[PDB]
Design an enzyme around this catalytic site. Sequence first.
Site, PDB file in Angstrom:
ATOM      1  N   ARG A  27      11.394  -5.005   6.486  1.00 31.22           N
ATOM      2  CA  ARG A  27      11.186  -3.598   6.038  1.00 31.22           C
ATOM      3  C   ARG A  27      12.040  -2.614   6.757  1.00 31.22           C
ATOM      4  O   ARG A  27      12.234  -2.746   7.965  1.00 31.22           O
ATOM      5  CB  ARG A  27       9.709  -3.184   6.237  1.00 31.22           C
ATOM      6  CG  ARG A  27       9.413  -1.722   5.975  1.00 31.22           C
ATOM      7  CD  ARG A  27       7.936  -1.473   5.702  1.00 31.22           C
ATOM      8  NE  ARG A  27       7.144  -1.767   6.900  1.00 31.22           N
ATOM      9  CZ  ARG A  27       5.869  -1.376   7.049  1.00 31.22           C
ATOM     10  NH1 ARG A  27       5.241  -0.743   6.055  1.00 31.22           N
ATOM     11  NH2 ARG A  27       5.237  -1.646   8.180  1.00 31.22           N
ATOM     12  N   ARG A  42      10.147  -0.074  11.975  1.00 30.03           N
ATOM     13  CA  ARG A  42       8.935   0.423  12.624  1.00 30.03           C
ATOM     14  C   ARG A  42       8.646  -0.513  13.806  1.00 30.03           C
ATOM     15  O   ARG A  42       8.818  -1.703  13.686  1.00 30.03           O
ATOM     16  CB  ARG A  42       7.773   0.445  11.618  1.00 30.03           C
ATOM     17  CG  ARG A  42       6.809   1.638  11.717  1.00 30.03           C
ATOM     18  CD  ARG A  42       5.863   1.664  10.499  1.00 30.03           C
ATOM     19  NE  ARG A  42       4.698   0.768  10.720  1.00 30.03           N
ATOM     20  CZ  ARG A  42       3.662   0.625   9.891  1.00 30.03           C
ATOM     21  NH1 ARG A  42       3.631   1.289   8.737  1.00 30.03           N
ATOM     22  NH2 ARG A  42       2.694  -0.275  10.173  1.00 30.03           N
ATOM     23  N   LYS A  78       0.781  -1.251   0.000  1.00 34.30           N
ATOM     24  CA  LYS A  78       0.000   0.000   0.000  1.00 34.30           C
ATOM     25  C   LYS A  78       0.808   1.294   0.000  1.00 34.30           C
ATOM     26  O   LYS A  78       0.627   2.111  -0.863  1.00 34.30           O
ATOM     27  CB  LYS A  78      -0.961   0.056   1.190  1.00 34.30           C
ATOM     28  CG  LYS A  78      -2.107  -0.893   1.126  1.00 34.30           C
ATOM     29  CD  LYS A  78      -3.164  -0.518   2.176  1.00 34.30           C
ATOM     30  CE  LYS A  78      -2.702  -0.574   3.639  1.00 34.30           C
ATOM     31  NZ  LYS A  78      -2.909  -1.904   4.232  1.00 34.30           N
ATOM     32  N   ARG A 114      -1.126  -8.650  13.632  1.00 32.44           N
ATOM     33  CA  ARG A 114      -1.711  -7.760  12.605  1.00 32.44           C
ATOM     34  C   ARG A 114      -2.214  -8.533  11.434  1.00 32.44           C
ATOM     35  O   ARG A 114      -3.240  -8.201  10.873  1.00 32.44           O
ATOM     36  CB  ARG A 114      -0.632  -6.806  12.040  1.00 32.44           C
ATOM     37  CG  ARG A 114      -0.170  -5.780  13.038  1.00 32.44           C
ATOM     38  CD  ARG A 114       1.158  -5.196  12.675  1.00 32.44           C
ATOM     39  NE  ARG A 114       1.087  -4.548  11.402  1.00 32.44           N
ATOM     40  CZ  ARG A 114       2.125  -4.165  10.671  1.00 32.44           C
ATOM     41  NH1 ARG A 114       3.375  -4.336  11.070  1.00 32.44           N
ATOM     42  NH2 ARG A 114       1.892  -3.560   9.525  1.00 32.44           N
ATOM     43  N   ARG A 152     -10.681  -0.369   6.593  1.00 37.00           N
ATOM     44  CA  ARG A 152     -10.195  -1.719   6.682  1.00 37.00           C
ATOM     45  C   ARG A 152     -11.134  -2.630   7.511  1.00 37.00           C
ATOM     46  O   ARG A 152     -10.724  -3.691   7.934  1.00 37.00           O
ATOM     47  CB  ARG A 152      -8.783  -1.713   7.227  1.00 37.00           C
ATOM     48  CG  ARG A 152      -8.715  -1.444   8.700  1.00 37.00           C
ATOM     49  CD  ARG A 152      -7.333  -1.735   9.159  1.00 37.00           C
ATOM     50  NE  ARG A 152      -6.352  -0.886   8.612  1.00 37.00           N
ATOM     51  CZ  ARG A 152      -5.102  -1.179   8.269  1.00 37.00           C
ATOM     52  NH1 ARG A 152      -4.574  -2.385   8.310  1.00 37.00           N
ATOM     53  NH2 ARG A 152      -4.370  -0.149   7.835  1.00 37.00           N
TER      54      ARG A 152
END
Length: 215
Positions: A127, A160, A13, A171, A88
Site C-alpha cells: 500500500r 504507513r 474499508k 494486526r 472492531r
Amino acid sequence: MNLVLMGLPGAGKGTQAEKIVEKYGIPHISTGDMFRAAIKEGTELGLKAKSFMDKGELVPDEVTIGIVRERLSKDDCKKGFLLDGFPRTVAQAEALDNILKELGKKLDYVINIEVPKEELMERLTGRRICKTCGATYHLIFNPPKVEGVCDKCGGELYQRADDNEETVANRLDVNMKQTQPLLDFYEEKGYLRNIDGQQDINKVFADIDALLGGL
Ligand SMILES: Nc1ncnc2c1ncn2[C@@H]1O[C@H](COP(=O)(O)OP(=O)(O)OP(=O)(O)OP(=O)(O)OP(=O)(O)OC[C@H]2O[C@@H](n3cnc4c(N)ncnc43)[C@H](O)[C@@H]2O)[C@@H](O)[C@H]1O
Ligand SMILES: [Mg+2]
Ligand SMILES: [Zn+2]
C-alpha cells in the site's frame, strides 16, 4: 444513513469509505485517522495510543469508546455518519449500541468487506498512501497514474508505519480474533451485510451502493 464499515486490515474499508463519502458526503469517522491525528499533535491520548498502534495492538476499548462517544455527539452526525474501523470488538459494538440509544439513533447497516486473511498481508505491505488527501493505492493491485503521485490531488505517496510486515502480521492476528464474535453480534441484530471484497473497487462499491440507495 448511520453506517459502520468493518473488515480485516487491508480488506478495503478506506477505499470504499472515500467512494461512499464522494457520493453521499456523510462524515467519515475513522478511529485510525483520529488516533493518527492525535499523534501528529502530541496530545497525551495520542502518545498513549501510539504504543499500541506501533505494535499492531488495539488501543484499549475505554479510550476508543470515549473518543467515538464525543465525536458522535456533534451536529454533523445528526443526520448520518460513516464509522470506519469502529466498532472492531464486541465490547465496542455494545458501547456503540448504547451511545446510539443516548442520542435517539440506530444503525442502518454494518457493512463487512470480506477478503480471505491469506490475501491481506500483500494488500498492506504494497500500500501507498497520499500525504495530502489520504487516498490509497497499491503498487501491484491498484497503482496510481504516475509513480509516486496521487491521482486526486497530485500529492506524494508514502508507506504507513504500521504497514511493515511484522506489524501487519500482528494486526491481522489481533483483528482476526475479534472478528468472528463481532460478526455474530451484528448477524443477530439483522443489519449485517457481507460484501465480496475480492472484486474490483468499482464493483465492490456497486454492491455497497445497492444497499445505500434508500438514504
Ligand atoms: N476501533 C478501534 N479500537 C482500537 N484500536 C483501534 C481502533 N481503530 C483503530 N485502532 C488502532 O489504529 C490502528 C489502525 O487502524 P485503521 O487505520 O482503522 O486500519 P485497519 O482497520 O487496519 O485498516 P487499514 O487502513 O489498514 O486497511 P483498509 O481496509 O482501510 O484498506 P485500504 O482501503 O487502504 O486498502 C488496502 C490496500 O488494498 C488496496 N485495495 C483496496 N481495495 C482493493 C480492491 N478491491 N482491489 C485491489 N486492491 C484494493 C488499496 O489500494 C490499498 O493498497 C489499529 O491497528 C489500532 O492500533
Ligand atoms: Mg483504512
Ligand atoms: Zn491525494
